[PDB]
Coordinates of C-alpha atoms and ligand atoms in Angstrom, one line a residue:
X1 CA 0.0 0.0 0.0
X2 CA 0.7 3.4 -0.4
X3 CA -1.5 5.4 2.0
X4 CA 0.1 6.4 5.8
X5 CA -1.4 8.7 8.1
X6 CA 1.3 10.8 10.1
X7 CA 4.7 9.5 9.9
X8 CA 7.4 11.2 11.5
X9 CA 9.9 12.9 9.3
X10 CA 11.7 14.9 12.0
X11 CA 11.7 15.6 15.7
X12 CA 14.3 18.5 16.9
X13 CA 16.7 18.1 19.5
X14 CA 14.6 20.0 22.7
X15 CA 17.0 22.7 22.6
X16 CA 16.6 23.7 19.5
X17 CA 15.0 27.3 19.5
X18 CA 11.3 28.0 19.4
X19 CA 9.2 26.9 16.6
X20 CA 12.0 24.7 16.5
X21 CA 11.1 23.6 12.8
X22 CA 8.7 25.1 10.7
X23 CA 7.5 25.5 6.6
X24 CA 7.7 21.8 5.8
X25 CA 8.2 21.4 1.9
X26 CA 8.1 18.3 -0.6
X27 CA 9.4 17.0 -3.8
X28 CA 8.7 14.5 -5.8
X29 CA 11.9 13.7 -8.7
X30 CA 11.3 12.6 -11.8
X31 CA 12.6 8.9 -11.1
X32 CA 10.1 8.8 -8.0
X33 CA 12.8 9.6 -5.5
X34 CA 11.1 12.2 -2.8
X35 CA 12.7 15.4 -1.1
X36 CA 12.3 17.1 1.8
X37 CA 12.8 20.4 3.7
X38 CA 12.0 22.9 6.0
X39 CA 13.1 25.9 8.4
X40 CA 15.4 24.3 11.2
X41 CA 15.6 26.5 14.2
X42 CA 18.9 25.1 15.2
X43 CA 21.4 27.0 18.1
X44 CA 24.0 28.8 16.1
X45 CA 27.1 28.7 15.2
X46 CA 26.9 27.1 13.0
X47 CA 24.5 29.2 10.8
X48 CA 21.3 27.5 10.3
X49 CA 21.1 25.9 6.8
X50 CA 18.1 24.1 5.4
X51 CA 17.8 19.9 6.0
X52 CA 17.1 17.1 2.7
X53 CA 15.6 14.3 3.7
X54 CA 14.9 11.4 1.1
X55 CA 12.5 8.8 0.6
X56 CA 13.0 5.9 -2.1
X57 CA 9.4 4.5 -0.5
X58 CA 6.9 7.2 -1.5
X59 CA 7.4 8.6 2.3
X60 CA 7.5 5.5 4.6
X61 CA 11.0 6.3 5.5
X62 CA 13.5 9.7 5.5
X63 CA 16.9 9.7 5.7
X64 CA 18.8 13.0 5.6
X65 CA 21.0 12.9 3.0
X66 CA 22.2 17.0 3.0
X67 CA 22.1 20.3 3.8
X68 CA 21.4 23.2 2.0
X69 CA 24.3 26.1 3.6
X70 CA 24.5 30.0 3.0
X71 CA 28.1 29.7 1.6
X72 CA 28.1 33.1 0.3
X73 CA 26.8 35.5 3.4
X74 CA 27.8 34.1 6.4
X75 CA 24.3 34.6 7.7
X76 CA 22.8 31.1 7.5
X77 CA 19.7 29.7 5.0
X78 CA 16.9 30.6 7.6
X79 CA 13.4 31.0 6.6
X80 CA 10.7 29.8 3.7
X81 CA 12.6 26.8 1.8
X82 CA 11.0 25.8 -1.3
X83 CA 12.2 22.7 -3.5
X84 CA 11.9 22.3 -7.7
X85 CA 12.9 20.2 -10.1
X86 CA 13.7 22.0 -13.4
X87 CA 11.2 20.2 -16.3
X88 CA 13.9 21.7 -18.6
X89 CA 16.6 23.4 -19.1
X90 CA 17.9 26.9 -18.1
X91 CA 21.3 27.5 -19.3
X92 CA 23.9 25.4 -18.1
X93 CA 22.0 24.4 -15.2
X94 CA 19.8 20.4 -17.5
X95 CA 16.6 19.1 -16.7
X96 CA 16.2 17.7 -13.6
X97 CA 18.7 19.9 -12.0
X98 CA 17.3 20.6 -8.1
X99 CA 16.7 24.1 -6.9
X100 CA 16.4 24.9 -3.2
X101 CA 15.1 28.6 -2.7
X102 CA 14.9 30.1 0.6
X103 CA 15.6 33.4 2.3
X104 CA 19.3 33.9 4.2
X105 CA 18.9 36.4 7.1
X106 CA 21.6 36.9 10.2
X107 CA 21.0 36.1 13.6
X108 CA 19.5 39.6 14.3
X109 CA 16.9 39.8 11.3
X110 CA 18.3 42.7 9.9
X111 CA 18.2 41.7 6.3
X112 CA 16.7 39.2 4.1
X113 CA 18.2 37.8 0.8
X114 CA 16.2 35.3 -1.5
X115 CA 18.7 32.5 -2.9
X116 CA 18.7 29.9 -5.2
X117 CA 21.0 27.0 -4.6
X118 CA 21.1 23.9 -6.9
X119 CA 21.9 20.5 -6.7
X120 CA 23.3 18.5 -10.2
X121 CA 23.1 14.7 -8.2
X122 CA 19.5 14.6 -7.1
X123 CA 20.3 16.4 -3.8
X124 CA 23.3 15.2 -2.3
X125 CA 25.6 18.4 -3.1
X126 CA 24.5 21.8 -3.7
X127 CA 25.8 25.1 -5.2
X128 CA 25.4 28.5 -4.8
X129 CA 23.5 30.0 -7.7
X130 CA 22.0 33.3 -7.8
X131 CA 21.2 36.0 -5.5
X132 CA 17.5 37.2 -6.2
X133 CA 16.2 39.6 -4.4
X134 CA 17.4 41.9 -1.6
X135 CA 15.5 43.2 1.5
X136 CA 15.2 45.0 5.0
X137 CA 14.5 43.1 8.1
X138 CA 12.6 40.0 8.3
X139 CA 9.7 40.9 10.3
X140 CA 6.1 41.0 8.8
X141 CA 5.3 44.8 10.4
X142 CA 4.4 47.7 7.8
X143 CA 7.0 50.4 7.0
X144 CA 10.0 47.6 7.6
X145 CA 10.8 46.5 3.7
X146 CA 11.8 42.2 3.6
X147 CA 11.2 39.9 1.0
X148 CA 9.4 36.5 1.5
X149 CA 8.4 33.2 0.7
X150 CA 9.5 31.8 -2.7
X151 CA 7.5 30.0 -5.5
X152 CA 9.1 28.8 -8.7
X153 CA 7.6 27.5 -11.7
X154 CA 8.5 27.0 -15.2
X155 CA 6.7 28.9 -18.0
X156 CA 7.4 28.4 -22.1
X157 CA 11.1 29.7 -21.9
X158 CA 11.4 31.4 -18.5
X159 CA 11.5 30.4 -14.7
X160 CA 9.3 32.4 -12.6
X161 CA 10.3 33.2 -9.3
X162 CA 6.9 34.2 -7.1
X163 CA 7.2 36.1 -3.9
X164 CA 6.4 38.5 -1.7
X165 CA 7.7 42.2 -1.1
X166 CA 7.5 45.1 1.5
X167 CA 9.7 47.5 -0.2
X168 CA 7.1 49.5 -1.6
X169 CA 6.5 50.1 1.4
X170 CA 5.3 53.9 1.2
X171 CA 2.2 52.0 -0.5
X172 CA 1.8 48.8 0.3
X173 CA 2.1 47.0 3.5
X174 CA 3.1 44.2 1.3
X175 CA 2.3 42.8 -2.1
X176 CA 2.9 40.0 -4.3
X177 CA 5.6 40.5 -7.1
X178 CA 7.9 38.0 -9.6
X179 CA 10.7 37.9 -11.6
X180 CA 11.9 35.9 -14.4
X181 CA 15.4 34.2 -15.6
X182 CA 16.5 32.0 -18.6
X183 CA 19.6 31.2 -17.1
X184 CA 19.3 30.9 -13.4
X185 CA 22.1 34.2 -13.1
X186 CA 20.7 36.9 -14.6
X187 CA 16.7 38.3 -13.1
X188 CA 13.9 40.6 -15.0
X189 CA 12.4 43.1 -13.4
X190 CA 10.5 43.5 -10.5
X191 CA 6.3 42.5 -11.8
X192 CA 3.7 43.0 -9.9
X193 CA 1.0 40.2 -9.5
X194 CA -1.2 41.6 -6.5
X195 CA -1.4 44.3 -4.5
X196 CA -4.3 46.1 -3.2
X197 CA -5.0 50.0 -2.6
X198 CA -5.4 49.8 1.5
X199 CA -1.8 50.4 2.7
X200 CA -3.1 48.0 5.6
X201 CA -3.8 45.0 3.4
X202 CA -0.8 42.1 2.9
X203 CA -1.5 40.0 0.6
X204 CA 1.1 36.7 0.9
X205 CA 2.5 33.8 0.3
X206 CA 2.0 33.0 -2.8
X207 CA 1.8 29.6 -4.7
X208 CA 0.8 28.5 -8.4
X209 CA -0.2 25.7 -10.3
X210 CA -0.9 24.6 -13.9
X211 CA -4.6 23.7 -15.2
X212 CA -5.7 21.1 -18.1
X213 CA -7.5 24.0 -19.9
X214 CA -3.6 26.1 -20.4
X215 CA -5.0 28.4 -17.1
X216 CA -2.9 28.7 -14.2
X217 CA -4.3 29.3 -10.7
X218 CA -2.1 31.7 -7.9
X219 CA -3.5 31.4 -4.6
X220 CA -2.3 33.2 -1.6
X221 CA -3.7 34.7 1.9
X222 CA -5.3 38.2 2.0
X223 CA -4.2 39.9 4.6
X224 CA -6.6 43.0 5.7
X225 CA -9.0 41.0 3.5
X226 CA -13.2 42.0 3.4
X227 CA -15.6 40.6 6.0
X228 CA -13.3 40.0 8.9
X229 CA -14.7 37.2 11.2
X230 CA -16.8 38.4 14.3
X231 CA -14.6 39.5 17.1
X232 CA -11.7 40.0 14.8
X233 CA -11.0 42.8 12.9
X234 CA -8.3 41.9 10.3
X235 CA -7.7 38.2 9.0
X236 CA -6.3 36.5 6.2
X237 CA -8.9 34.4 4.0
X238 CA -7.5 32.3 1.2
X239 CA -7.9 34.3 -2.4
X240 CA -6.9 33.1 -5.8
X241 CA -6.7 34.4 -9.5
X242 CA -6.7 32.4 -13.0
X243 CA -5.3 33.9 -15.7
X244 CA -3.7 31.9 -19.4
X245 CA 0.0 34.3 -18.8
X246 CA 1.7 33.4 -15.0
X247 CA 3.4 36.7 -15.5
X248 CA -0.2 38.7 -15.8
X249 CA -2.5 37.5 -12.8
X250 CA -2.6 41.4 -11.6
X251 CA -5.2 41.9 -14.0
X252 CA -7.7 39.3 -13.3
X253 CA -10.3 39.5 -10.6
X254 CA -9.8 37.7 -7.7
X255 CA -11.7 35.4 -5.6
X256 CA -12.2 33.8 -2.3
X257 CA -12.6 30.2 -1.6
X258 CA -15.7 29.7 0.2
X259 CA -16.9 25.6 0.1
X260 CA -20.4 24.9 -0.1
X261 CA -20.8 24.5 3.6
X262 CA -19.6 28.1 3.9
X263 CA -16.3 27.2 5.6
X264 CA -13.7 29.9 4.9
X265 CA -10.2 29.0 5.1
X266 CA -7.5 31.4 6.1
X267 CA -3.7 32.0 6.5
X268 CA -0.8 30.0 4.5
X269 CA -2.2 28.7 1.9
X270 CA -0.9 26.0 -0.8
X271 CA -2.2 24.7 -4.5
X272 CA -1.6 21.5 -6.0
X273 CA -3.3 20.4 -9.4
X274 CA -4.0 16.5 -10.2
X275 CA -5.4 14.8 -13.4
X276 CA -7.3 12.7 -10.5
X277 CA -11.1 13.3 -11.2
X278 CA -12.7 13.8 -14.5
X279 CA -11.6 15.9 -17.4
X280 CA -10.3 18.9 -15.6
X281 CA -8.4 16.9 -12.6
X282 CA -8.9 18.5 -8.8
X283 CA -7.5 21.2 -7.6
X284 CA -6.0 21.3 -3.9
X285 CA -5.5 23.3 -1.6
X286 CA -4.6 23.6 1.8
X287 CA -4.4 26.3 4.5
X288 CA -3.0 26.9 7.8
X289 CA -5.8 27.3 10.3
X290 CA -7.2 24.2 9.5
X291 CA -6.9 20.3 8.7
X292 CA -9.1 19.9 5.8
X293 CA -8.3 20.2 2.3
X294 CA -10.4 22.1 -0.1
X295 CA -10.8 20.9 -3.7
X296 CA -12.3 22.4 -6.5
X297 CA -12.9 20.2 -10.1
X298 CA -14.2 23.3 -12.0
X299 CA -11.0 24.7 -13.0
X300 CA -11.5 27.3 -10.1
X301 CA -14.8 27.7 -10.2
X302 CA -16.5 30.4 -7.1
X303 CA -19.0 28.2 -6.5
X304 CA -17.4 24.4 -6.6
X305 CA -15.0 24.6 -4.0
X306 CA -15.5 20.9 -1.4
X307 CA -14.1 20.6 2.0
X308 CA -12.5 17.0 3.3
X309 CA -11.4 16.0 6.3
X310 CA -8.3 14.2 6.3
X311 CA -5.6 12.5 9.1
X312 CA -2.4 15.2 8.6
X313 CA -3.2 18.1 11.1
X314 CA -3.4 21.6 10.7
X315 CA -0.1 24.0 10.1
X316 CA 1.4 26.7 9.2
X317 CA 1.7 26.6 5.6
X318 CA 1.1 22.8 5.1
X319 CA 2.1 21.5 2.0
X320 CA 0.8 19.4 -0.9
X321 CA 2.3 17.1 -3.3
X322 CA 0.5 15.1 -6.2
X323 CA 2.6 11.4 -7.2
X324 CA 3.6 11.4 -11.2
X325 CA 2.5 7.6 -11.4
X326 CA -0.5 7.4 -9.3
X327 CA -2.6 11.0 -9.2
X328 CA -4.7 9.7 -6.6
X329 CA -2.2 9.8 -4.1
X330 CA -1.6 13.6 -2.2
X331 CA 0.8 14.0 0.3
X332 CA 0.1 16.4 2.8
X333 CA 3.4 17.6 5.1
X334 CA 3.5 19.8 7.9
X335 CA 6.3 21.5 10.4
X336 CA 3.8 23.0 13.0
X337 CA 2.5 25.7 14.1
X338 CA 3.8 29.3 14.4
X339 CA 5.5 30.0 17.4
X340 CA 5.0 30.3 20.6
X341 CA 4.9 26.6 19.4
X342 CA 6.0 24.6 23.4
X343 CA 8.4 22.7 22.0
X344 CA 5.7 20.2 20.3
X345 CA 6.6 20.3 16.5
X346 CA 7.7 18.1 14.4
X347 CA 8.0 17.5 10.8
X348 CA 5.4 14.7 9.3
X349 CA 3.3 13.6 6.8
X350 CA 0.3 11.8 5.2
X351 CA -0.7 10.1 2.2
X352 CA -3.9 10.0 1.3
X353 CA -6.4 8.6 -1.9
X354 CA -8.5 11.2 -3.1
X355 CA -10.9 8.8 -4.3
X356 CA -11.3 8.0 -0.4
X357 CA -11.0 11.2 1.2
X358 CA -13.9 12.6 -1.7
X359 CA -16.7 10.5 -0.3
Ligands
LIG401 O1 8.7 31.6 7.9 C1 8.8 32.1 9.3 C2 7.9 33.2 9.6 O2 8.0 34.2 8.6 C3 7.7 35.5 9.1 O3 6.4 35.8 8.6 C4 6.5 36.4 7.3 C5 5.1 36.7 6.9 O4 4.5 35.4 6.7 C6 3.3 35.8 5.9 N1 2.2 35.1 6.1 O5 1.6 35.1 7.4 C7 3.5 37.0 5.1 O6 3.6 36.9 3.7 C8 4.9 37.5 5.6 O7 4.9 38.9 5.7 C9 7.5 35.3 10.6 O8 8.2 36.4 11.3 C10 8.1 33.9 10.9 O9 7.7 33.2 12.1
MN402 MN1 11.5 11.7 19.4
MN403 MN1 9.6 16.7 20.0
MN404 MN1 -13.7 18.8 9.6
MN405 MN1 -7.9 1.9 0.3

């Protein structure tokens, strides 16, 4: 069988410093192999880098087999890992080269720097690529001016880089911005992708996939968003925009996901796309104030968004991965909750059937 219900990737050393780990990331390589990550909270020196785990048994069983180190800053590999496997391509870096992306950031805070570090042997070395993008101090308050949470995906000829940006920060609080590359060294232009006309509102965390019909969904949370819950007066519901161009989703119109029980989910948000399901597949996606998934087999449509429960619990920014040979199967991986966390997280993870969880 294939299915597990929360397996233990990681448990940190007690010591390690509060969340402890955090931001729990998956990849699936193209022979089947599976990677993992996430932000390790680890006493420094040394500089805290980012862990790869590896399993050969679709997530039975991990192994760390590296790290991912800041070898250029001598400020560590500290927050929002993300892990891709290029489908092509980009210069001299071949298909199926591994990118980690994450954001370096001393010991104090004071800066953050996006990275991308690759891997040529399926995530046993890694090398220093590119710097990306350059920013103030890493803490999410308006008027300070970092750079967050990476998202990369391929498009035609270019490889989008997808994250999120407080230097405009005369007029946003934060927004949602790319840039592109065709050979991993050299990056475009800052492009906006969201941003919204209340300084107050922080849009975040963005994530993307691919649809059967050539349309791509971008989901992220809305910070500041309408029709705060009773009691509260800002949250962050769950919002996403379709659009045919990656590069263009500022233009479309955006939506919340609301399932048809009303349920609204909020913070941390993350998209998968599977062919599981009829002609145009399921969309998935998780958030990180609560355990269920939401699907949606309307290519996005308002009104066609499902809740499930499943086994994996809630966290922050909990992840989702569809298997290549068997689209039926999502994993669902989590590092926790945001801190003040007690010492209690850990990394895990659950597979799950689709066509079970959907009943
Ligand atoms: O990854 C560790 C966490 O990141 C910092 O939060 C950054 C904000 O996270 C978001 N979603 O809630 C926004 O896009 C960012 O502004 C936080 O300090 C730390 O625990
Ligand atoms: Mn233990
Ligand atoms: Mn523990
Ligand atoms: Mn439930
Ligand atoms: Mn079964």
């Amino acid at each position: 069988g294939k299915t597990f219900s929360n397996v233990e990737i990681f448990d940190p050393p007690t010591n390690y410093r509060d969340p402890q780990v955090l931001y729990a990331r998956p990849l699936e390589l193209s022979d089947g192999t599976l990677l993992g990550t996430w932000e390790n909270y680890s006493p420094e020196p040394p500089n805290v880098w980012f862990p790869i785990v590896k399993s050969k048994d679709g997530g039975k069983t991990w192994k760390e087999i590296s790290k991912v180190k800041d070898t250029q800053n001598n400020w560590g590999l500290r927050y929002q890992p993300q892990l891709y496997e290029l489908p092509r391509a980009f210069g001299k870096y071949p298909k199926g080269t591994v990118l980690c992306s994450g954001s370096s950031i001393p010991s104090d805070l004071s800066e953050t720097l996006i990275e991308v570090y690759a891997s040529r042997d399926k995530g046993y070395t890694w090398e220093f690529v590119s710097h990306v993008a350059l920013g103030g101090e890493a803490l999410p308050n308006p008027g300070l001016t970092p750079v967050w949470e990476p998202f990369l995906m391929t498009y035609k000829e270019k490889l989008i880089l997808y994250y999120s940006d407080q230097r405009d920060n005369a007029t946003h609080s934060q927004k949602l911005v790319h840039q592109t590359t065709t050979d991993l060294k050299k990056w475009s232009k800052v492009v906006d992708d969201t941003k919204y006309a209340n300084y107050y509102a922080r849009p975040g965390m963005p994530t993307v996939a691919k649809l059967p019909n050539n349309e791509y969904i971008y989901v992220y949370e809305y910070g500041g968003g309408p029709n705060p819950p009773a009691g509260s007066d800002y949250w962050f519901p769950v919002y996403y925009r379709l659009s045919k161009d990656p590069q263009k989703f500022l233009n479309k119109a955006h939506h919340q996901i609301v399932s048809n029980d009303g349920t609204t989910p909020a913070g941390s948000p993350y998209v998968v796309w599977t062919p599981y399901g009829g002609k145009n597949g399921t969309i998935v996606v998780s958030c990180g104030t609560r355990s269920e998934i939401f699907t949606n087999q309307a290519l996005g449509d308002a009104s066609a968004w499902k809740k499930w429960d499943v086994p994996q619990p809630t966290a922050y920014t909990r992840s989702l991965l569809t298997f290549q040979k068997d689209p039926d199967l999502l994993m669902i991986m989590g590092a926790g909750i945001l801190p003040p966390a007690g010492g209690k997280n850990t990394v895990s993870a659950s597979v799950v059937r689709l066509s079970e969880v959907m009943k």
